[PDB]
Assembly symmetry: D2
Homo-oligomer: 298 residues x 4
């Protein structure tokens, strides 16, 4: 077999805005900070990057910046490129490739609730359209559908490029199911609070929200775990629980961008509708939780 | 207060394909069939019409065909125009108006899970962009979010054009809450099996899947209920239960397009990925359930 | 069949110094009878069946039977268990104490399969000679009696005559009555009493009626007589109180309301139930002030 | 704080019937088989032991047999003693102590849905009634209520006897929460498929269904994990996934008793209503899954 893979400590990059546009210099600065704090790959325009409200041109711009910023380093770019329309997801995958992405993260179709057969055909079309690695992304709370274990495994076996899945499903039983039946895949944590449990069961990385704020801590947790230093990895996972939970007190990326702004890491607490600022109470909750953590500057 | 409204028996039109393109002649012929069977409005490019996978040029085509076909008739066009990006939902509402729609149906943002404040701001922007009726559309099983009762009522009260909500949420308690607190709105059933309970509680129409296949029966049900002939409305609702439920044995519009094909009302059983044909077992179930109903031809 | 339908009340069970307040219980039942109620349910969920002893179960059923004697009002006794042998025994017990019928909750905790639920209820129904109403409340039991199982039991067992549904699932109510219109669908969810009745439901077993018996009976009887406009008007007026009565697990809010209304002297439960939070206490307090609460 | 504890590999004992009565000779023989296969504690009359349908005399009989069978060995008896009525749960706790149990497993109140405050007072009264260890048992899918992390932690800290919780909630996030905020407690897996993830996060034992059939494999999994031999523990957990899942194809203990019968370990496949035999379909599925496993006799 021997598929090409992108694994390790990875970050679902927030997308900073200034005056309604992507702040490209801030975006670059944030990526450099991830690289300097032990991150192995970055994910431009994932859910956390507000992919839904960026234009396709902004999609390109963000991917190009990530690629340029990672040159001269080992850090890879796993570009968000996914859609609930298969023709669009295919086109997005090819564009990501054309724009220098090392691999793609492709979310399960949201809203239109395809069957498992439909999911198989969707991802097969996507994988056949490019020659770079493809990571599936299961997040049923947002999409309204679940890629089943059987479908994930069938895709992994049938399509050379498809090498694993980012799970954001709060279902450790499924994580056991996946790796028990197909130990060759890369299971990637899409849920910060349970990064350590997923890694300790043989998961091989994380695509993290929390790492935007605490890249050094997420990187350490991940690399301790990858080395079977489980006591060390669990210690950081336990320490991170409070922040990992508060970062979801309202829908991601509302709390993470709020945190980045509070920390002085971005200049404006600005979103695109229908996302908006958190409630005053949640703003204050996030602020208090942060005080317990050492937040790396630039 | 005296809002412009679009109510009564309405159909979420399927979109027929032929060789990967919208079958334009067939779409017109299906709409004419709805008109001739007592339907009060049609909804081009809703969920049932595969809005997700149609291009923006195709949305335009479908809306224009609906508008042309209903011209010279009492039938209104409530065009699907909705997005999880507020800038895009505004654009699409303006476009729908420009192509002659009488009103728009605007789905709650899917996938990105805005907060109630976000939803308020989203819909306020959409309502402010046009001068035609706007019906909200709540379908949490597909979007991952819920427009709360309070948000819906605030939108109804604050925004001239917003006149009610299509509820597809299996939640009769919420239907009670909505009409007990704001009896002036138009609550529309987006769930065929429970059309009668929604209407008998003061709901004022349906946006129906089943009516694609059985337009005369849905329109009769609806009109009886609006005339307070609950006995006759319930009789048809009970008779329709079997078909109403089998049309969701797989994600809509997979079963309804299967039925339309079986009835000889569309030429090709064809979807756009990630949607695809049903399993052999479900196909057979749909075929058998159909036998109990009289299906109108052209 | 032989049936018990109409407006019915899931009686709360008042405590004083950790004992069933037998005086109070009789008095509260009298108050239900005098406010248009068609039947009472001693020792249902609302009655804290879980924490009463078998002797107290007997006592409440006896007091209900006695208070309704000579009156039009029937007693549909709570008599259910997650052990079939015990549910059979409680059914016989209820009939012995002169109940007109029993309300029998789906087994909680042990999650029997549909085949198991059928055998459970078949065993009970074949054991006594009085009406049996199934009672489906998946949020509390961890299982659901499916439409197919409910219909099969109704068709197969002469004395099983319907189901109390507490499942927030109007689709299922349509399913049940479309496929088997002869059964008695009974609302176990006050906020949606009107939608269940308007689809051909034939009664309610109500929590709210403890506090507002006249309004719940009025609503029910208007709907049974097809005055939907008046039934809906009352269902709408009741929504706020109907919702606040579940702000914490029933019967915590209804006992709180009965206490605040001066209808019971003490706000006493049996553990593990206990008084509501301060925030919820106050909410209940304020919601009640929009309603006329009848005294004795 | 030096709490007394009962941890390690533990079995929720099935209760065999013969001619409608507890088969006492079979029960003793089944317990001896557990002891001889590396089990550290047995749980008579838990959920798996059909506590709901046993009479109180039968509870006494099962506890007495477990107690007697464990004499002369290190194996402990953690007796099921719980109820949804606090007065009865107190009574059962005392009765378990009197019949020689080393500790009690006490299920959250089912059916009546107590609030967090009610749960606190429930378990506080239970803990004050005896001087032996008390393990909480959270199983929301069966009880309709959840003991929150805050409540479990408050009980652990406030009540000398309460030493931990058996979690059967499919919620590894909550397992993280519990041990991150209160590392001194004994988190026990009540969900076989996820035994390894719970143990690798610092859980200290399992109360197992699967161990009825495969006590040596569950014992080895547990002891490898407790020694931080995570590779070896995970390997068994993976191997066991298929049997762990099929043992819940119908409500436990229906599949486990079916497996014991198929294995020749009990003489009849007998339940007390409302429990009953599995479908013929599921009977066959269980039989097929077992073929892959080595099963020890007596
Ligand atoms: Mg016109």
């Amino acid at each position: 077999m021997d598929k090409n893979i992108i694994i390790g400590a990875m970050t679902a990059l927030i997308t900073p805005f200034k005056n309604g546009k992507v702040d490209e210099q801030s975006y670059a600065r944030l990526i450099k900070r991830q690289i300097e704090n032990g991150i192995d790959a970055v994910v431009p325009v994932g859910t956390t990057g507000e992919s839904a409200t960026l234009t396709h041109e902004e999609h390109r711009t963000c991917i190009e910046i990530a690629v340029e910023t990672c040159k001269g380093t080992k850090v890879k770019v796993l570009a968000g490129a996914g859609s609930n329309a298969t023709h669009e997801a295919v086109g997005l995958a090819k564009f990501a490739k054309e724009h220098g992405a090392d691999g793609i993260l492709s979310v399960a179709p949201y809203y239109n609730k395809p069957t498992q057969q439909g999911l198989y055909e969707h991802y097969k079309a996507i994988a056949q359209s490019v020659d770079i690695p493809v990571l599936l992304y299961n997040v049923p709370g947002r999409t309204g559908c679940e890629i089943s274990t059987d479908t994930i495994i069938k895709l992994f076996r049938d399509c050379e490029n498809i090498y694993g899945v980012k799970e954001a499903s709060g279902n450790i039983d499924k994580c056991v199911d996946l790796l028990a039946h197909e130990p060759r895949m890369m299971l990637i944590s899409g849920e910060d609070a349970i990064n350590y449990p997923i890694l300790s069961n043989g998961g091989k990385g994380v695509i993290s929200v929390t790492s935007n704020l605490l890249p050094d801590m997420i990187s350490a947790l991940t690399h301790f775990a990858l080395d079977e230093n489980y006591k060390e990895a669990k210690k950081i996972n336990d320490e991170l629980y409070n922040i990992n939970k508060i970062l979801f007190c309202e829908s991601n990326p509302i709390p993470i961008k709020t945190a980045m702004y509070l920390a002085g890491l971005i200049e404006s607490l600005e979103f695109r509708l229908p996302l908006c600022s958190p409630s005053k109470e949640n703003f204050a909750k996030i602020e208090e939780v942060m005080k317990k953590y050492k937040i790396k500057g630039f």
